[PDB]
Amino acid sequence: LVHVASVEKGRSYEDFQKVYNAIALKLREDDEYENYIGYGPELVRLAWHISGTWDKHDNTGGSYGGTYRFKKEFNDPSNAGLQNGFKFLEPIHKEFPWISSGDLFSLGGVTAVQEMQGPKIPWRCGRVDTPEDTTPDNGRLPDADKDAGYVRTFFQRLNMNDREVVALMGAHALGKTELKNSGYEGPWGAANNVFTNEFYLNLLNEDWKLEKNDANNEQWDSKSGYMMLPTDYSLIQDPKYLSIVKEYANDQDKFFKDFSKAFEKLLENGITFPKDAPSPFIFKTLEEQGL
């Protein structure tokens, strides 16, 4: 199974910058969402969940086909809490009907990271919507009640190594957990609508206590009111992950560089780009455009 990237007819960098802008402007418009967390974290989680269905062994799932638009995937229990993010992008798709679903969902994540003062993330167009019978079954996204061995083996399916895994998990600086979505409660950090290396700092510097929450799940809690999933906490239980957590806690610039690379890779898994395909785009933020 091969997915060849196909540029949307007659579309170039400037067309996609306008889609970026529409997303980024709507982020400002709806910045009150979830007591001023805004939609940024949800768009990042959405981009990851639509990419994270990939299986490298047979190239099923992945961002290419834009299959999240189909009810089987949209209603995956693992995707609870993303519906509002989907609905956020819906009017933007209607405004730019020419863009593919996969391109729009992935671009949403890129836009959100950059507008939350994160790293620039190069982005490529060319995902092509595929039919409903190409939708991956539920159950491909990872469980949070697991250990380091699980995290490591899980991410092998996405062709991610230790550094890529630890870098990607740093997106938990953003947003929060909600009992009604995932059975977990609380934020990882204080500044959770800004993309920083706070996740790693909090992992290392808070005192964590294992507690049962109101959903009967166990999570690691601090007296500052922060929490860590068991899979988060496994990054300091495992000696190889620990070393990398320390590196990113000490050097946000390095975290940013490694995250940019791993996130683009995540969003592009499964896609074959023709040799004459356009080079990756790096979009300007609203601020850089004086918008």
Ligand code: HEM
């Ligand atoms: C072992 C892999 C992972 C597990 C188990 C996991 C688990 C979770 C859970 C349980 C939540 C709370 C969801 C809710 O209740 O609404 C969450 C939120 C979130 N995750 Fe992850 N995650 C993983 C990997 C990643 C990666 C790799 C990224 C980023 C590239 C990411 C980005 C996010 C973001 C942005 C949110 C917050 C969304 C919001 O505030 O609504 N996660 N995750």
Ligand SMILES: [Mn+2]
């Ligand atoms: Mn949320």
